[PDB]
Design a binder for this molecule. Structure first.
Ligand SMILES: Cc1cc2nc3c(=O)[nH]c(=O)nc-3n(C[C@H](O)[C@H](O)[C@H](O)COP(=O)(O)OP(=O)(O)OC[C@H]3O[C@@H](n4cnc5c(N)ncnc54)[C@H](O)[C@@H]3O)c2cc1C
Ligand SMILES: Cc1cc2nc3c(=O)[nH]c(=O)nc-3n(C[C@H](O)[C@H](O)[C@H](O)COP(=O)(O)OP(=O)(O)OC[C@H]3O[C@@H](n4cnc5c(N)ncnc54)[C@H](O)[C@@H]3O)c2cc1C
Lengths: 240, 245
C-alpha cells in the first residue's frame, strides 16, 4: 500500500536492476560462502507460486555460464523470466549507479514502514524484519567502490538499529501495549527515555533519508573540500 | 587535561578500562594469525593512548612475546612486574573480575573521553579529528574476550549506531574548521531537528547519551532474543547525575 509516485516507480526499477546485477555475480562466485550469501540475498530481495518460480531463476543464475558477458547474461535473463512468468522481475533501465543502490535501500525502507502500518495484530512481520536486517547487513555494491564499501560497513548499524526498535515496538504490542504512531523522530526518541510504545510514522523512510544525507555530508571530509534533502521535501516527493 | 568529573562510577569505568585493556593484551600470546596479532596490538596501543607512548610500546612488545603456555594468573603476575619496571603502574587494574559490565564501562569511558576532547578542543581541531577516527576503530573492533557468541553477533549488527554519531562530531568539527562554529545544545532532540535544515548544532555530552541509549537498547532487545516479557531502565537524567555531567 505504498503511494504510487514518479520517484517510487524509479525506486521500483532500481530495485529490479539491483537484483539483476546481483544474481549475475552468482556465476562468478569464487567461494561457497559467497555463493550462499549472494543467492540468499537475491531470494530475499525478490521476496519483497512466485516463490517457487524465484527459486528456478536463482538456480538458473547459479549454473549460468561464467563466460557470458553482462550483455549476454541480460539476454538469457530476459528469456528465463519470460519463461517463468516473471516479466515483473524485469528492469526497464539497466544503467547501474550509486543511485541504483540508494533507490534499493529507500525501497526496502518503504516496504518496512508499509508492513508495520498494514500489519495484522505479527510474528510474520517480525520475521520479515529479521530478513530485512540481513539484507541491510549484506548490501553488495557490485560496482567498484572500495571507500564506499568500508564506510557503509562502519555505519550500517545505524539503519539496522532502527529496524530493532521496530522489533521491540512489535514485541511490546504482542504483549499488551499497542503502538502509538507519532509524527516526528523526536517524539519517539524522547519517549524511549523513561510503558510507552511510540513509533515514528514512516520511520525507515526518515532513517534512510537522514542516512543518505549523512554519507553525502561525510564525503566532503573524505576528500579535503569545503562543501540537501529535507524530510518535508521527501514526504512530498513520495506522498508520505 | 581530562576535564572529566571525578565520580564513584567514573572510577569504576577507569578501572574496567584497565581490566579490559589487560585482558586484551593477554590474547596476544595466543594469536593464531598475523591479522589478529596486528589488530589486537593496534587496539591495545590505542586503548592505552587514551613518555608514556614508548613505554606502552615496550609493554605491547612484551605481551607479543609472552609465553603461550602461561595461565591467566601467571600472565597477570608477569604483567604487574612489567608495568612496574616500565613506570606504568597507572596501567595496573585494581579489580580483575571480568564481566559484561567490564565491556560496558570501557565503552562508556571511551564515550566520555570523546565528549571531553570536543568540549576542551583548541580551534588541535585536526588533532581531535584524528582522535575520533581512532575512536571509530576502537568501537568497530570491540573484543568480547569472554565467551559470548550472541552478544558478539548483535553488536556487529548495530555498532554502526555509535560510530555514526562519531561521524556527526567529525562533520561538526569540519564545518567549524570552515567558519561555522559549533553550537552546543542540551538535548538530543534539538540536535536532530537541527540536522533537518548553516547550522552546526551538537549535543553537549553527545556520546555519553548515545552510549547510554545504546546500552538500554541491548537490554530491551535481549527479551526478544530469549523470548519473554520483561524493570527499571537507565535515564539520561540520572546518568548525568551519577556522572556529574
Ligand atoms: C550505502 C552507500 C554508501 C555510500 N558511501 C560513500 C562514501 O563513503 N564516500 C563517497 O564518496 N560516496 C559514497 N556513496 C555514494 C554517494 O552517496 C553518492 O551516490 C555519490 O557521491 C554520487 O553523487 P550524487 O549526488 O549523484 O548521489 P546522490 O545525491 O546521493 O543520489 C542522487 C539521487 O539521490 C536523491 N537524494 C539525494 N539525497 C537524498 C536523500 N537524503 N534521501 C533520499 N534521496 C536523496 C536525489 O534526489 C537524487 O535523485 C555511498 C552510496 C551508498 C548507496
Ligand atoms: C557491546 C555489548 C553487546 C552486548 N549484546 C548482548 C546481546 O545481544 N544479548 C544478550 O543477552 N546480552 C548482550 N550483552 C550483555 C548485556 O548487555 C548485559 O550486560 C547482560 O545481559 C548482563 O546483564 P546486566 O543487567 O548484569 O548488565 P547491565 O544491565 O548493562 O548493568 C551493568 C551496569 O551497567 C549500568 N547500566 C545499566 N544500564 C545502563 C545504561 N542504559 N546506560 C549506562 N549504564 C547502564 C548499570 O549501573 C550496571 O551497573 C552485550 C554487552 C555489551 C558490552
Amino acid at each position: 500500500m505504498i503511494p504510487l509516485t514518479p520517484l517510487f516507480s524509479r525506486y521500483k526499477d532500481s530495485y529490479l536492476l539491483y537484483s539483476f546485477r546481483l544474481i549475475d555475480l552468482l556465476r562468478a562466485s569464487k567461494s561457497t560462502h559467497l555463493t550462499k550469501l549472494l543467492s540468499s540475498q537475491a531470494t530475499y530481495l525478490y521476496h519483497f507460486i512466485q516463490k517457487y518460480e524465484v527459486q528456478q531463476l536463482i538456480e538458473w543464475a547459479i549454473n549460468a555460464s561464467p563466460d557470458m558477458d553482462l550483455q549476454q547474461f541480460r539476454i538469457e535473463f530476459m528469456d528465463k523470466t519470460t519463461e517463468l512468468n516473471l516479466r515483473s522481475c524485469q528492469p526497464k533501465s539497466f544503467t547501474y549507479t550509486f543511485t541504483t543502490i540508494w533507490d534499493t535501500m529507500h525501497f526496502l525502507s518503504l516496504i518496512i514502514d508499509d508492513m508495520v502500518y498494514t500489519r495484522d495484530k505479527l510474528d510474520f512481520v517480525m520475521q520479515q524484519l529479521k530478513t530485512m536486517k540481513v539484507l541491510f547487513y549484506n548490501v553488495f555494491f557490485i560496482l567498484q567502490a572500495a571507500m564506499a564499501r568500508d564506510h557503509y560497513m562502519n555505519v550500517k548499524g545505524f539503519i539496522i538499529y532502527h529496524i530493532e526498535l521496530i522489533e521491540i515496538a512489535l514485541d511490546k504490542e504482542k504483549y499488551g501495549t499497542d503502538i502509538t504512531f507519532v509524527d516526528s523522530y523526536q517524539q519517539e526518541t524522547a519517549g524511549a527515555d523513561v510503558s510507552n510504545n511510540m513509533l515514528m510514522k514512516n520511520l525507515m523512510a526518515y532513517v534512510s533519508m537522514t542516512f543518505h544525507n549523512h554519507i553525502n555530508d561525510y564525503k566532503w571530509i573524505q576528500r579535503n573540500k569545503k562543501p540537501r534533502m529535507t524530510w518535508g521535501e521527501y514526504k512530498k516527493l513520495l506522498n508520505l
